[PDB]
Design an enzyme around this catalytic site. Structure first.
Site, PDB file in Angstrom:
ATOM      1  CG  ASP A  79      -2.274   0.737   1.004  1.00  0.00           C
ATOM      2  OD1 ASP A  79      -2.525   1.299  -0.081  1.00  0.00           O
ATOM      3  OD2 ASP A  79      -3.078   0.769   1.976  1.00  0.00           O
ATOM      4  CE  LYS A  95      -2.838   5.196  -1.365  1.00  0.00           C
ATOM      5  NZ  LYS A  95      -4.077   4.876  -2.157  1.00  0.00           N
ATOM      6  CG  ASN A 132      -1.485   4.947   2.164  1.00  0.00           C
ATOM      7  OD1 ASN A 132      -2.409   5.762   2.265  1.00  0.00           O
ATOM      8  ND2 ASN A 132      -1.628   3.771   1.570  1.00  0.00           N
ATOM      9  CG  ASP A 140      -3.444   3.550   5.909  1.00  0.00           C
ATOM     10  OD1 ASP A 140      -3.395   4.062   7.049  1.00  0.00           O
ATOM     11  OD2 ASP A 140      -4.108   4.032   4.970  1.00  0.00           O
ATOM     12  CB  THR A 160      -2.643   2.993  -5.244  1.00  0.00           C
ATOM     13  OG1 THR A 160      -3.230   2.999  -3.940  1.00  0.00           O
ATOM     14  CG2 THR A 160      -2.975   4.293  -5.971  1.00  0.00           C
TER      15      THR A 160
HETATM   16  N1  LIG Z   1      -1.497   8.329  13.737  1.00  0.00           N
HETATM   17  C1  LIG Z   1      -2.059   9.156  12.844  1.00  0.00           C
HETATM   18  N2  LIG Z   1      -1.824  10.492  12.995  1.00  0.00           N
HETATM   19  C2  LIG Z   1      -2.381  11.348  12.124  1.00  0.00           C
HETATM   20  C3  LIG Z   1      -3.169  10.971  11.081  1.00  0.00           C
HETATM   21  C4  LIG Z   1      -3.433   9.592  10.861  1.00  0.00           C
HETATM   22  C5  LIG Z   1      -4.208   9.098   9.767  1.00  0.00           C
HETATM   23  S1  LIG Z   1      -4.825  10.155   8.490  1.00  0.00           S
HETATM   24  O1  LIG Z   1      -6.191  10.470   8.770  1.00  0.00           O
HETATM   25  O2  LIG Z   1      -3.887  11.204   8.238  1.00  0.00           O
HETATM   26  N3  LIG Z   1      -4.816   9.195   7.172  1.00  0.00           N
HETATM   27  C6  LIG Z   1      -6.090   8.714   6.601  1.00  0.00           C
HETATM   28  C7  LIG Z   1      -5.907   7.445   5.787  1.00  0.00           C
HETATM   29  C8  LIG Z   1      -4.977   7.604   4.602  1.00  0.00           C
HETATM   30  N4  LIG Z   1      -3.586   7.228   4.956  1.00  0.00           N
HETATM   31  C9  LIG Z   1      -2.932   8.117   5.955  1.00  0.00           C
HETATM   32  C10 LIG Z   1      -3.722   9.397   6.201  1.00  0.00           C
HETATM   33  C11 LIG Z   1      -4.447   7.759   9.618  1.00  0.00           C
HETATM   34  C12 LIG Z   1      -3.916   6.847  10.514  1.00  0.00           C
HETATM   35  C13 LIG Z   1      -3.145   7.263  11.561  1.00  0.00           C
HETATM   36  C14 LIG Z   1      -2.879   8.642  11.768  1.00  0.00           C
END
Ligand SMILES: Nc1nccc2c(S(=O)(=O)N3CCCNCC3)cccc12
Lengths: 353, 18
Positions: free
Chosen positions: A169, A171, A174, A187, A204
């Protein structure tokens, strides 16, 4: 030869030590993999502050622990929606992986729990936002800047692969940037424990290896292809294979005909030709020397791998933060109250969560 | 340019998984 006696012995000892550290890391992973943790907090323990990102499964919200005052990112998954989208196994697998791994560039799961309506994964808040935002904001990263990030992914994939995990995954969307300018991977829904081959068409379009697109099976080498795509996009500002529609992207990928910007160093092009290699028998990371073919490439000559792992390298970019709970590095999303049903939904399906 | 073609592809924003 390419190395004298001193250099060759140092490099060989270094690589043997890497193997020893990874064997121990795998034992610790497998202990937690076989006996996962569960129900280590509850919803009323946190104040909800702001939505950080939104997806099909649900929401990721910035929250604050009511007792410790700490900030966290809480991923909220709607059980019925996860069922409806047939994502039960992916969701359970993501949580199982997150609680079992341990690496400096892998997000830390602090708590998890569930209620009648939702599953909750409470992670360390990574406040700098997505690499995607920073990349598109400045256009492209300098080669040293891209190399700094690339080296962290190289070490992260070397770790994951030693656990027999394929990531699949990768990119800029992420990859999160933390307060020190270092990368965090969050992710793992598409990650799979694979000791041999696997077949799932997932990921993707821009980042798919040819053998994922084609009906043949594939292995962890698809992650090294995806690393080539990421390095290219970081250094160019756009990915190597694009088109209006995914089918035409897939045709370019399976040809693997790559053009490089004229500002790419010859060192970078050589590395990318070996990562974006359509022939499995020739792709870097998939040869007899494994990841060391990548780590020992001339483009990484200035990379101090131990220093990167120890997070002692000065980051090329530090996100600005005007205080705890600052979300200025994230997009804005429509708020919505978390509604908990009086009736338990899909309890049987999510017993292991 | 290749970059102009990238813009023309419309795949310049965040990309969804398949
Ligand atoms: N520990 C984290 N701290 C900030 C933001 C976080 C996010 S997120 O909304 O920024 N997120 C949404 C899914 C797409 N991949 C990454 C981006 C996702 C997972 C953990 C996070």
């Amino acid at each position: 030869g390419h190395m004298g006696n001193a250099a060759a012995a140092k490099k060989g000892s270094e690589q043997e030590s890497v193997k020893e550290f990874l064997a121990k890391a795998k034992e610790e992973f497998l202990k937690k993999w076989e006996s996962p943790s569960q129900n280590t907090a509850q919803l009323d323990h946190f104040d909800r502050i702001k939505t950080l990102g939104t997806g099909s499964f649900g929401r990721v919200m910035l929250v604050k622990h009511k007792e410790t005052g700490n900030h966290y990112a809480m991923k909220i998954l709607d059980k019925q929606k996860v069922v409806k989208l047939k994502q039960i196994e992916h969701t359970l697998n993501e949580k199982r992986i997150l609680q079992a791994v341990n690496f400096p560039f892998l997000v830390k799961l602090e708590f998890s729990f569930k209620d009648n309506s939702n599953l909750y994964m409470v992670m360390e808040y990574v406040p700098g936002g997505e690499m995607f935002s920073h990349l598109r904001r400045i256009g492209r990263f300098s080669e040293p800047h891209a190399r700094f990030y690339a080296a962290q992914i190289v070490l992260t994939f070397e770790y994951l692969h030693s656990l027999d995990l394929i990531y699949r995954d990768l990119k800029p969307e992420n990859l999160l940037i933390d307060q020190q300018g270092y990368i965090q991977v969050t992710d793992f829904g598409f990650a799979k424990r694979v000791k041999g081959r696997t077949w799932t068409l997932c990921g993707t379009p821009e980042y798919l290896a040819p053998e994922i697109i084609l009906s043949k099976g594939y292995n962890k080498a698809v992650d090294w292809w995806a690393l080539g795509v990421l390095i290219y996009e970081m250094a160019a500002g756009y990915p190597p294979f694009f088109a209006d529609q995914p089918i035409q992207i897939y045709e370019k990928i399976v040809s693997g005909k790559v053009r490089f910007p004229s500002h790419f160093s010859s060192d970078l092009k050589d590395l990318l030709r070996n990562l974006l290699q359509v022939d499995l028998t020739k792709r870097f990371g998939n040869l007899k020397n494994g990841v060391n073919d990548i780590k020992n490439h001339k483009w990484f000559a200035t990379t101090d791998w131990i220093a990167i792992y120890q997070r002692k390298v000065e980051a090329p970019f530090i996100p600005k933060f005007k205080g705890p709970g600052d979300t200025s590095n994230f997009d804005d999303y429509e708020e919505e109250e978390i509604r908990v049903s009086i009736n338990e939904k899909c309890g049987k399906e999510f017993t292991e969560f | 340019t290749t970059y102009a073609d990238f813009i023309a592809s419309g795949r310049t924003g965040r990309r969804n998984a398949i």
